[PDB]
Amino acid sequence: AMTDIRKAATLVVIRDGANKDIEVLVVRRAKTMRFLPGFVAFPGGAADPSDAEMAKRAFGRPVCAEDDDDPALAVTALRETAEEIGWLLAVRDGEGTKMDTPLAPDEQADLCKGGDALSAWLSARGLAFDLGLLRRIGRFVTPPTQPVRFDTRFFLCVGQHLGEPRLHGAELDAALWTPARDMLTRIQSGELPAVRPTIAVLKALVACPNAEIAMSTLSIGP
Ligand SMILES: [Ca+2]
């Protein structure tokens, strides 16, 4: 009756792909999940307390940040992405050297234990996120007609350097780089379910000529 509106964030990782179309990392929730089984989405999830702590050690600020919680939510998005697909995006040290390697299976497994695992892994290394590599592209609150509600902050970043996503555990049954047009058609046709914000991001990416133009202009309006 008095539904929690859960703060969350999602990361839309893109690259310039085949046929001059943008490609994006998507994941699919396993049929065994209790909430939204089989839904396609981008990596993301609920805010954790260590997210704002890591944001205070971060470099820079998200492009098109408008609110005081944008740095913490950018971190939420980056953390959830590392847990889901095994890559830590936008990491650097004090000298500006970028991390460009994936997490080993064991480090991804350790990050999925939750708590302050990511904050600890970064702080043992003197590393932090460069939030300047993310663009705030939207904010969506689930309609009050829904029994489970989120207030989700969407960020965009470019992953032209990334290899393949790697899963940990059973929550997701698939993860891949897909042209945004391909995925959109599959949702519009009814083949795969997706929440409204997911569709609206895919349509924005399809209208966009390339990843540089997206990092300069992308915005999802309700
Ligand atoms: Ca997640």
Short mmCIF file of C-alpha atoms and ligand atoms in Angstrom, two decimals:
data_model
loop_
_atom_site.label_atom_id
_atom_site.label_comp_id
_atom_site.label_asym_id
_atom_site.label_seq_id
_atom_site.Cartn_x
_atom_site.Cartn_y
_atom_site.Cartn_z
CA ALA A 1 0.00 0.00 0.00
CA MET A 2 2.91 2.51 0.87
CA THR A 3 5.37 1.22 -1.74
CA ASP A 4 9.15 2.00 -1.27
CA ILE A 5 10.54 4.02 -4.24
CA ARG A 6 13.97 2.43 -4.43
CA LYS A 7 16.92 4.59 -5.61
CA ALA A 8 18.81 2.73 -8.42
CA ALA A 9 21.09 3.35 -11.38
CA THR A 10 21.79 1.81 -14.70
CA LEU A 11 24.79 1.96 -17.04
CA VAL A 12 24.37 2.07 -20.81
CA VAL A 13 27.75 0.97 -22.20
CA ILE A 14 28.11 1.61 -25.93
CA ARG A 15 30.54 1.34 -28.80
CA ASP A 16 30.60 2.13 -32.54
CA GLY A 17 29.65 -1.19 -34.17
CA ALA A 18 29.17 -2.97 -37.48
CA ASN A 19 27.36 -1.10 -40.30
CA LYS A 20 28.04 2.25 -38.52
CA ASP A 21 25.36 1.37 -35.91
CA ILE A 22 25.84 1.82 -32.15
CA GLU A 23 26.14 -1.44 -30.18
CA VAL A 24 25.32 -1.70 -26.45
CA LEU A 25 25.83 -4.19 -23.60
CA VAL A 26 22.61 -5.79 -22.53
CA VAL A 27 21.82 -8.59 -20.11
CA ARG A 28 18.83 -10.92 -19.67
CA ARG A 29 17.40 -11.94 -16.25
CA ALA A 30 17.23 -15.73 -15.86
CA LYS A 31 13.76 -17.46 -16.01
CA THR A 32 14.60 -18.57 -12.40
CA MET A 33 14.55 -14.98 -11.01
CA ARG A 34 11.43 -14.03 -8.98
CA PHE A 35 11.37 -10.46 -10.26
CA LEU A 36 11.01 -9.72 -13.99
CA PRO A 37 12.32 -13.14 -15.24
CA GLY A 38 13.34 -13.06 -18.90
CA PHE A 39 13.44 -9.26 -19.10
CA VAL A 40 16.28 -7.67 -21.11
CA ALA A 41 17.97 -4.62 -19.57
CA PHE A 42 21.22 -2.84 -19.06
CA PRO A 43 23.44 -3.57 -16.02
CA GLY A 44 22.25 -1.76 -12.91
CA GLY A 45 20.64 -2.00 -9.53
CA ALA A 46 19.84 -0.48 -6.19
CA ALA A 47 22.05 2.11 -4.56
CA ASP A 48 24.34 0.83 -1.71
CA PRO A 49 25.83 3.03 1.14
CA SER A 50 29.44 2.49 -0.09
CA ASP A 51 28.44 4.13 -3.45
CA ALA A 52 28.36 7.70 -2.01
CA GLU A 53 31.60 6.90 -0.06
CA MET A 54 33.39 5.92 -3.31
CA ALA A 55 31.90 8.96 -5.06
CA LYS A 56 33.69 11.29 -2.53
CA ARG A 57 37.07 9.68 -3.64
CA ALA A 58 36.18 9.88 -7.37
CA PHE A 59 37.79 12.09 -10.04
CA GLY A 60 35.62 14.52 -11.87
CA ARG A 61 31.81 14.60 -12.14
CA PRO A 62 29.31 13.10 -14.60
CA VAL A 63 28.64 15.04 -17.84
CA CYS A 64 25.13 16.63 -17.48
CA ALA A 65 25.02 15.95 -13.68
CA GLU A 66 22.17 18.13 -12.29
CA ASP A 67 21.75 16.76 -8.73
CA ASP A 68 23.92 16.22 -5.65
CA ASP A 69 23.31 12.48 -5.77
CA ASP A 70 24.45 12.06 -9.44
CA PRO A 71 28.09 11.17 -8.46
CA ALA A 72 26.93 8.49 -5.98
CA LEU A 73 24.39 7.06 -8.50
CA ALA A 74 27.13 7.03 -11.26
CA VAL A 75 29.10 4.86 -8.85
CA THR A 76 26.03 2.62 -8.24
CA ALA A 77 25.85 2.10 -12.01
CA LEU A 78 29.60 1.35 -12.37
CA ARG A 79 29.58 -1.03 -9.40
CA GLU A 80 26.48 -2.99 -10.62
CA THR A 81 28.10 -3.25 -14.07
CA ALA A 82 31.32 -4.75 -12.58
CA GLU A 83 29.23 -7.27 -10.65
CA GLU A 84 27.15 -8.28 -13.68
CA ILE A 85 29.64 -8.38 -16.55
CA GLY A 86 33.08 -8.48 -14.89
CA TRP A 87 34.51 -5.20 -16.21
CA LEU A 88 35.29 -2.10 -14.11
CA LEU A 89 34.72 0.88 -16.30
CA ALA A 90 36.20 4.38 -15.91
CA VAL A 91 38.80 3.44 -13.29
CA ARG A 92 42.12 5.33 -12.98
CA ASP A 93 44.86 6.16 -10.46
CA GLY A 94 46.14 9.58 -9.27
CA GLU A 95 48.54 9.83 -12.23
CA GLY A 96 45.62 9.39 -14.70
CA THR A 97 46.60 5.89 -15.81
CA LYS A 98 43.38 4.05 -16.95
CA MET A 99 42.59 0.48 -15.94
CA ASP A 100 41.86 -1.46 -19.20
CA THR A 101 41.79 -5.05 -18.00
CA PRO A 102 38.78 -7.14 -16.98
CA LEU A 103 38.35 -8.46 -13.47
CA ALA A 104 39.53 -12.02 -13.00
CA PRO A 105 36.63 -14.50 -12.27
CA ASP A 106 37.67 -14.56 -8.53
CA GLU A 107 37.63 -10.74 -8.18
CA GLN A 108 34.20 -10.62 -9.90
CA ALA A 109 33.03 -13.38 -7.52
CA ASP A 110 34.33 -11.31 -4.52
CA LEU A 111 32.53 -8.16 -5.80
CA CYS A 112 29.25 -10.15 -5.99
CA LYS A 113 29.46 -10.88 -2.22
CA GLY A 114 28.29 -7.23 -1.99
CA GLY A 115 28.93 -5.07 1.05
CA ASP A 116 32.04 -2.87 0.74
CA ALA A 117 33.93 -5.40 -1.52
CA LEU A 118 34.39 -2.93 -4.43
CA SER A 119 35.27 0.02 -2.16
CA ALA A 120 37.87 -2.24 -0.43
CA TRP A 121 39.32 -3.52 -3.73
CA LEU A 122 39.73 0.07 -5.02
CA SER A 123 41.10 1.50 -1.68
CA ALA A 124 43.80 -1.21 -1.39
CA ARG A 125 45.01 0.06 -4.82
CA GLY A 126 44.55 3.84 -4.51
CA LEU A 127 42.13 3.75 -7.48
CA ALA A 128 38.81 5.52 -8.11
CA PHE A 129 36.26 6.16 -10.81
CA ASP A 130 36.65 8.97 -13.36
CA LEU A 131 33.00 10.14 -13.34
CA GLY A 132 33.84 12.53 -16.22
CA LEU A 133 33.60 9.41 -18.50
CA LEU A 134 29.83 9.08 -17.74
CA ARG A 135 26.99 11.15 -19.05
CA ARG A 136 23.69 11.43 -17.14
CA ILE A 137 21.04 10.61 -19.78
CA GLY A 138 17.86 10.22 -17.79
CA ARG A 139 15.91 9.63 -14.62
CA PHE A 140 12.81 7.44 -14.46
CA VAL A 141 10.48 6.67 -11.63
CA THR A 142 8.33 3.55 -11.96
CA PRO A 143 4.62 4.64 -12.23
CA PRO A 144 2.65 4.43 -8.91
CA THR A 145 0.36 1.76 -10.53
CA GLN A 146 3.29 -0.76 -10.14
CA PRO A 147 3.78 -2.89 -6.99
CA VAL A 148 7.62 -2.60 -7.07
CA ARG A 149 9.01 0.88 -7.80
CA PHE A 150 12.44 2.37 -8.50
CA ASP A 151 13.74 5.86 -9.05
CA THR A 152 16.46 5.03 -11.56
CA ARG A 153 19.31 7.26 -12.77
CA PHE A 154 20.62 6.33 -16.25
CA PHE A 155 24.26 6.99 -17.29
CA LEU A 156 25.98 6.47 -20.59
CA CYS A 157 29.69 5.60 -21.24
CA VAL A 158 31.74 4.30 -24.10
CA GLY A 159 33.30 0.83 -23.99
CA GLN A 160 35.12 0.64 -27.37
CA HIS A 161 38.06 -1.04 -25.51
CA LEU A 162 36.08 -3.77 -23.67
CA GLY A 163 36.13 -7.40 -24.62
CA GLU A 164 33.20 -9.72 -23.95
CA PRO A 165 30.91 -9.49 -20.85
CA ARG A 166 31.41 -12.35 -18.39
CA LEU A 167 28.68 -13.59 -16.09
CA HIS A 168 29.00 -14.64 -12.43
CA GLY A 169 26.32 -16.76 -10.84
CA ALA A 170 22.78 -17.56 -12.04
CA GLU A 171 20.90 -14.21 -11.92
CA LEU A 172 21.50 -13.40 -15.61
CA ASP A 173 21.37 -16.06 -18.29
CA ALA A 174 22.88 -13.97 -21.09
CA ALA A 175 24.99 -10.89 -21.72
CA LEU A 176 26.17 -9.57 -25.04
CA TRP A 177 27.11 -6.66 -27.27
CA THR A 178 24.11 -6.06 -29.49
CA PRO A 179 23.31 -3.46 -32.18
CA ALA A 180 20.61 -1.24 -30.49
CA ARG A 181 18.35 -1.56 -33.65
CA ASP A 182 18.37 -5.45 -33.42
CA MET A 183 17.35 -5.42 -29.73
CA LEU A 184 14.71 -2.73 -30.23
CA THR A 185 13.00 -4.73 -33.04
CA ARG A 186 13.02 -7.84 -30.81
CA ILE A 187 11.26 -5.93 -28.00
CA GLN A 188 8.77 -4.09 -30.29
CA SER A 189 7.87 -7.47 -31.87
CA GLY A 190 7.11 -9.01 -28.45
CA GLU A 191 9.94 -11.62 -28.58
CA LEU A 192 11.61 -10.21 -25.39
CA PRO A 193 10.15 -8.12 -22.51
CA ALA A 194 11.72 -4.80 -21.40
CA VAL A 195 10.73 -1.85 -19.13
CA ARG A 196 9.75 1.46 -20.84
CA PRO A 197 13.08 3.28 -20.01
CA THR A 198 15.03 0.43 -21.70
CA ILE A 199 13.06 0.86 -24.94
CA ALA A 200 13.43 4.68 -24.80
CA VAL A 201 17.27 4.32 -24.46
CA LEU A 202 17.42 1.91 -27.43
CA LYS A 203 15.36 4.27 -29.62
CA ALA A 204 17.70 7.19 -28.59
CA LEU A 205 20.76 5.10 -29.55
CA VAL A 206 19.18 4.11 -32.94
CA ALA A 207 18.56 7.84 -33.79
CA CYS A 208 22.18 8.63 -32.91
CA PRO A 209 24.90 8.45 -35.65
CA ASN A 210 27.84 7.39 -33.43
CA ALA A 211 29.14 7.01 -29.86
CA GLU A 212 30.88 10.50 -29.84
CA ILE A 213 27.57 12.22 -30.81
CA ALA A 214 25.77 10.14 -28.14
CA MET A 215 28.28 11.21 -25.41
CA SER A 216 27.56 14.85 -26.48
CA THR A 217 23.75 14.85 -26.88
CA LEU A 218 21.99 11.77 -25.58
CA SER A 219 19.03 12.45 -23.38
CA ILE A 220 15.92 10.45 -22.62
CA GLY A 221 12.92 12.76 -21.97
CA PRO A 222 9.82 11.08 -20.38
CA CA B 1 22.40 -5.66 -10.74
#
